[PDB]
Amino acid sequence: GLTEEQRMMIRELMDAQMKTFDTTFSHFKNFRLPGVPSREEAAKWSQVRKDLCSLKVSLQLRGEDGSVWNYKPPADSGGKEIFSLLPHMADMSTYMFKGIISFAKVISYFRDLPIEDQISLLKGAAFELCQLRFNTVFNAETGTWECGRLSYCLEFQQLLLEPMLKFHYMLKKLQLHEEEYVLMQAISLFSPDRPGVLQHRVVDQLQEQFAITLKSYIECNRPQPAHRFLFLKIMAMLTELRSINAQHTQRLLRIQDIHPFATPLMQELFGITSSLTERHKILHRLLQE
Amino acid sequence: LTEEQRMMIRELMDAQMKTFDTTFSHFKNFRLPGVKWSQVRKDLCSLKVSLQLRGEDGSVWNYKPPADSGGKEIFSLLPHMADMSTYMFKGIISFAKVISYFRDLPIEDQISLLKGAAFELCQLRFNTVFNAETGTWECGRLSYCLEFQQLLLEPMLKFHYMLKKLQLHEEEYVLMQAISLFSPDRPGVLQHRVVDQLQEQFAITLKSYIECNRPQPAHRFLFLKIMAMLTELRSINAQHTQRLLRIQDIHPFATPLMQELFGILTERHKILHRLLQEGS
Ligand SMILES: C/C(=C/CC/C(C)=C/CC/C(C)=C/CC[C@]1(C)CCc2cc(O)cc(C)c2O1)C(=O)O
Ligand SMILES: C/C(=C\CC/C(C)=C/CC[C@]1(C)CCc2cc(O)cc(C)c2O1)CC/C=C(\C)C(=O)O
């Protein structure tokens, strides 16, 4: 079985996930909706089209009363068309990040870290934990993220070429337990090599204890040896996600540059314009309640 | 065709072109569905549509309406429909105003003719953008799609299918509009005799137009079919007015212009009087 700390550490993470993951998105509200050239400035746009080309979704909003609003995005011509959903998605991301921040605040091991490292970790990990939560509401038969009354539907070996999409299919294929998802979130959260992390050694030892807990959970709770390598598959998914995160940051900056849309909290997280707390005032304030 | 008949068709066609914006480009700022009772429900059930909105950029918003669970949700599309009806009624008012035979009537009979015919002329115009294969009224960037033997038992829907089959020319539609507009026997019409003689010359002109243009055996009796169609449209009008009043009673939604036209002299129709006093 699992040691006592390991059982308690899982309890604390499941508690924190229960308290801060709105699995029905009931409190996502007030979001924006799509309404009813220099030589190297046009090079920028052709690059931004290469960014958004495989990540195209339609949007469904189911009303209380039974009605359905459905938004199909425009085909790419050239110009503003390809950003029509970006304000909405910025609002969804921002709402997901607030739940990630609250998730981190709840965890004793994250609390007892110095505020500047809390900022650097969340800055490094927020997109990754958002993707991990999104995977739990991904329906891989229909290519759809089911977010309560909202749904994002993709529009298939071409699809499996975009790393972000191949990540969700593969991770979904593993059929992980809630406990495995929440330990994945902790391992990603406590990554000792995020930019600006000063307490490398404490964060490294925290991560390894979460990884050891997950390794033992799998040995104890799944029918060995059919799941002989599940732990290592999960670690490889996290490594791929760390790279998807880097790709996504650069994509977001390119888009932001030619078409601003990121929220103030997204600006802080992704480095969009003194010390670390002065350049992260929102994030800092959210950590202190 | 006479010279007076060629002229009259020319004026009606020119009036239609000036006042029927078939791309609906200038329909904007309308309400959208948010993001006794046993009889009101009999009314709205066969007349169920979804709504489509194609944006300039190529994007599409679709609204599928809720199924009935005995609530106010059966009325979600009514504010929007009222706005569309109100844009169409203003186009119909402009159409009547550029016709010389109508401009010349007393302001009083202008008001009564428009009260009596605005719905009919709107349905005739709607019929020219009706796609009968897909059950859709294609109004530019907006489309209204019917949610079949069950449907053909709703008289307003049967009217649209039967009229489309006749395959009328623009000239026949606009003459239908004129014959319907100049009905002598509308409530409040004083100059019965004048209106009747105008109605008769539009009907004679349609009959002659149909003979100088439609030789095929597929079009035998076309003029009489059209006229019977106009009589059915007048009955559909009276039924639509009853439905509209019931629903307004348990759930207001009518625009001020609709309230004037449907009854919810010149003094009590301020908006019509004003629009009729404005130029073209
Ligand atoms: C708004 C935004 C823009 C960053 C630039 C890119 C690459 C956007 C495409 C992102 C996209 C279509 C992702 C679909 C995949 C999931 C896995 C699907 C659901 C979802 C909802 C969101 O609200 C945000 C994201 C990223 C998201 O990705 C952001 O990154 O915030
Ligand atoms: C029958 C009824 C409403 C539904 C009428 C309906 C859904 C009709 C569909 C058929 C056409 C033939 C198609 C499109 C359309 C658009 C409109 O904007 C108005 C109407 C009547 C209309 O009917 C009574 C209330 C009157 C209203 C809302 C009005 O009079 O608005």
Account of the protein in words:
2 copies of one chain form a homodimer. Helix content of chain A is 56%, strand content 8%. In chain A, a hairpin with a 2-residue loop joins strand 4 and strand 5. In chain A, helix 5 runs antiparallel to helix 7 and helix 7 runs antiparallel to helix 8. With 289 residues, chain A is α+β, with helices and mostly antiparallel strands. A 5-stranded antiparallel sheet of chain A has the order 2-1-5-4-3, with no helix packed on it. Chain A has a single domain, classed as Retinoid X Receptor. Chains A and B meet through strand 2 of A and strand 2 of B. The complex binds ligand NQD (2 copies). The site of one copy of the ligand C/C(=C\CC/C(C)=C/CC[C@]1(C)CCc2cc(O)cc(C)c2O1)CC/C=C(\C)C(=O)O has 16 residues of chain B, from helix 3, helix 5 and helix 9. The PDB classes it as transcription. The entry lists the keywords Garcinoic Acid, nuclear receptor, transcription.
